[PDB]
Amino acid sequence: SWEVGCGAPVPLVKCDENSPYRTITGDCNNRRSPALGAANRALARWLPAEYEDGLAVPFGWTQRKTRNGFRVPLAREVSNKIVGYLDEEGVLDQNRSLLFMQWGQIVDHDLDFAPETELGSSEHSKVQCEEYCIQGDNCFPIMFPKNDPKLKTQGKCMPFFRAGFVCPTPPYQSLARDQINSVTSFLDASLVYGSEPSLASRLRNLSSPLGLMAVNQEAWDHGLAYPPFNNMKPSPCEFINTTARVPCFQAGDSRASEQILLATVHTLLLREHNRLARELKRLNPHWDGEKLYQEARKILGAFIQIITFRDYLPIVLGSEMQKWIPRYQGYNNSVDPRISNVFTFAFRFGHMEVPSTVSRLDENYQPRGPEAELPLHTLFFNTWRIIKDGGIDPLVRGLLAKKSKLMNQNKMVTSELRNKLFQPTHKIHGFDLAAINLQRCRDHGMPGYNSWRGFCGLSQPKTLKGLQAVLKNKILAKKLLDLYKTPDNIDIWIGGNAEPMVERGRVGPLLACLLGRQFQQIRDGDRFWWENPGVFTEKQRDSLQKVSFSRLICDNTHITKVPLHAFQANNYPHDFVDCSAIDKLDLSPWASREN
Ligand code: HEM
Ligand SMILES: *[C@@H]1O[C@H](CO)[C@@H](O)[C@H](O)[C@H]1NC(C)=O
Numbered sequence: 001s002w003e004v005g006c007g008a009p010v011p012l013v014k015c016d017e018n019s020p021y022r023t024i025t026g027d028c029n030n031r032r033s034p035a036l037g038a039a040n041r042a043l044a045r046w047l048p049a050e051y052e053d054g055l056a057v058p059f060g061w062t063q064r065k066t067r068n069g070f071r072v073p074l075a076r077e078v079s080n081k082i083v084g085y086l087d088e089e090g091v092l093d094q095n096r097s098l099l100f101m102q103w104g105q106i107v108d109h110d111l112d113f114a115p116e117t118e119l120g121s122s123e124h125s126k127v128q129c130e131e132y133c134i135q136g137d138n139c140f141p142i143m144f145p146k147n148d149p150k151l152k153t154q155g156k157c158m159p160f161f162r163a164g165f166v167c168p169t170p171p172y173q174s175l176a177r178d179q180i181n182s183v184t185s186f187l188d189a190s191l192v193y194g195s196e197p198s199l200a201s202r203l204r205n206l207s208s209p210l211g212l213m214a215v216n217q218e219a220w221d222h223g224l225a226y227p228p229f230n231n232m233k234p235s236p237c238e239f240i241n242t243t244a245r246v247p248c249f250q251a252g253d254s255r256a257s258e259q260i261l262l263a264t265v266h267t268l269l270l271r272e273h274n275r276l277a278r279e280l281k282r283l284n285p286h287w288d289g290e291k292l293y294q295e296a297r298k299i300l301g302a303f304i305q306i307i308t309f310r311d312y313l314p315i316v317l318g319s320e321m322q323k324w325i326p327r328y329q330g331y332n333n334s335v336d337p338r339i340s341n342v343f344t345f346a347f348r349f350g351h352m353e354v355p356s357t358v359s360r361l362d363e364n365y366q367p368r369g370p371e372a373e374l375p376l377h378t379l380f381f382n383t384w385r386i387i388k389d390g391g392i393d394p395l396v397r398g399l400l401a402k403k404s405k406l407m408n409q410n411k412m413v414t415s416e417l418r419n420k421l422f423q424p425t426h427k428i429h430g431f432d433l434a435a436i437n438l439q440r441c442r443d444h445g446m447p448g449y450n451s452w453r454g455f456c457g458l459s460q461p462k463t464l465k466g467l468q469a470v471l472k473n474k475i476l477a478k479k480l481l482d483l484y485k486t487p488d489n490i491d492i493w494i495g496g497n498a499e500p501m502v503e504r505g506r507v508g509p510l511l512a513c514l515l516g517r518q519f520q521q522i523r524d525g526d527r528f529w530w531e532n533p534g535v536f537t538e539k540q541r542d543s544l545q546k547v548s549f550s551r552l553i554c555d556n557t558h559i560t561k562v563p564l565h566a567f568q569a570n571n572y573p574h575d576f577v578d579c580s581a582i583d584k585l586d587l588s589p590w591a592s593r594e595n
């Protein structure tokens with residue numbers, strides 16, 4: 001009657017009340033409402049979902065149905081007209097390393113996932129969708145516009161399948177359609193350890209009772225670990241080189257192998273854990289397997305919290321930083337720590353920070369190997385270039401010494417993503433992350449640009465001139481009003497990202513507001529925030545305050561020259577210093593004083 005809850009699946013909850021550890025599923029973080037910010041629950045709605053039929057069907061589903069008296073443009077057309085660009089000269093960010101981009105993706109992956117409906121098993125309908133392009137129940141294919149190069153070479157559509165939703169897939173969902181966040185809303189390193197108990201356990205070395213995360217027994221990197229392989233056929237990392245047959249890696253997050261540098265940063269994180277559990281043993285030889293695991297896990301979740309909040313968020317938000325994320329004042333139980341649906345789009349700003357090439361560098365930071373730099377597209381689901389060529393060390397140097405793409409109103413998303421994206425089970429390097437993002441906004445029943453501007457106490461343009469004034473771009477504004485007719489209809493993703501960057505930051509005001517609230521909320525609503533009184537000891541927190549991405553590299557690679565500030569643009573050797581000048585993590589406070 002009153003729709004107390006829609007979650008018939010995943011009822012299991014036992015809250016140990018005295019537990020000194022987060023759960024894997026993020027359940028029992030909040031006490032009054034223990035499901036808040038836990039994996040497998042619905043994404044939060046900061047505003048009501050806007051659907052065609054006000055329930056589930058996305059805007060753009062039915063031809064003859066309008067938003068506010070206008071038809072929504074095609075995703076791919078918005079992509080072609082606005083998002084795409086030819087010229088890769090000039091696009092690089094003078095003050096952000098490629099690591100800047102990377103960490104965004106890491107943090108994102110920790111926070112949210114809304115995977116597709118997994119409905120087409122023992123069912124051709126996931127291919128019926130693919131090659132026939134027939135708009136089905138959860139098949140929502142992206143149609144090419146009439147002047148599109150991809151029409152000529154690669155069919156009539158790009159395939160797409162709607163995201164999963166609570167109260168399973170087959171019947172009408174109670175009330176409106178809400179999408180699942182399949183990972184924990186907390187900045188908890190879930191991408192390393194998993195969000196379900198199954199993965200969590202399968203990821204660990206339970207054979208050695210020293211609380212280590214299971215590593216690879218088939219290949220090594222100069223005596224340092226790799227992630228174990230996920231042997232589940234088909235493997236898209238196998239698919240891309242059939243000769244190499246190197247499968248995708250296995251991590252606490254499914255998407256670890258989407259691209260080589262994410263797999264790389266996943267590899268650093270795993271290593272730091274092992275490195276932390278091996279030490280904990282020395283200082284505490286009496287600790288059991290799980291105590292070593294659990295106690296290293298909290299150090300790592302804390303590490304991710306510090307890098308993100310101290311180093312990453314200030315250079316994303318800049319001026320807006322303090323307006324949205326005031327300095328810490330302790331856990332508030334009344335905060336909603338759940339990731340909002342809109343955040344999983346706000347944080348796609350990263351898509352425009354991704355450049356068209358990745359480099360491998362040697363100890364001199366020179367082109368390592370003849371084919372040193374490679375097109376980004378050849379690196380989707382590519383694990384073999386880690387195993388068979390060079391390890392992670394040369395890649396990590398690229399992340400330091402190269403630049404992120406700067407976002408640009410005339411150059412938004414590289415073709416490497418716009419036209420050449422690889423998606424599992426779809427064979428071709430031929431897709432568009434931009435088009436996909438736009439279709440996803442609709443899929444998810446997103447309110448439009450102006451709804452979100454209103455929500456953030458910013459103005460809502462109605463005219464081309466209004467929009468021009470907001471975007472500070474006559475032409476961009478013009479192209480958007482030609483497509484969307486009204487700014488009320490501009491898809492949040494393209495609308496938020498169109499806004500010029502606030503001072504000393506990399507997003508506009510709307511995104512700064514959206515991101516800001518979310519990252520404010522996940523800090524304040526988290527009972528195990530590293531800096532929450534009680535989580536760590538005073539002695540521990542002064543040891544923790546010293547963590548640095550610089551250090552994580554030194555500890556977990558053979559790289560002995562790093563910058564002080566890894567997110568700034570840093571050039572070798574001018575801004576590089578030895579690993580001996582950089583603060584280690586002192587693990588002495590973790591020694592238990594027994595008798
Ligand atoms: C080469 C780099 C990257 C690739 C290839 C990539 C690719 C993708 C793909 C395929 C999706 C799924 C889209 C969908 O089905 O709706 C996605 C989602 C997403 N990406 Fe990226 N991405 C990259 C970098 C980044 C960066 C740097 C960020 C953030 C700074 C980011 C943030 C996101 C977020 C927040 C989502 C939504 C995740 C969810 O809730 O499901 N990505 N990306
Ligand atoms: C596949 O990998 C082998 C090394 O394993 C390499 O020499 C070859 O270039 C790769 N082929 C393609 C098409 O990626």
Ligand SMILES: *[C@@H]1O[C@H](CO)[C@@H](O)[C@H](O)[C@H]1NC(C)=O
Binds near residue numbers: 333335
């Ligand atoms: C806790 O959160 C609420 C709403 O989320 C906020 O208005 C209030 O100021 C906070 N209270 C404390 C004790 O900080």
Ligand SMILES: [Ca+2]
Binds near residue numbers: 111183186187189190
């Ligand atoms: Ca998480």
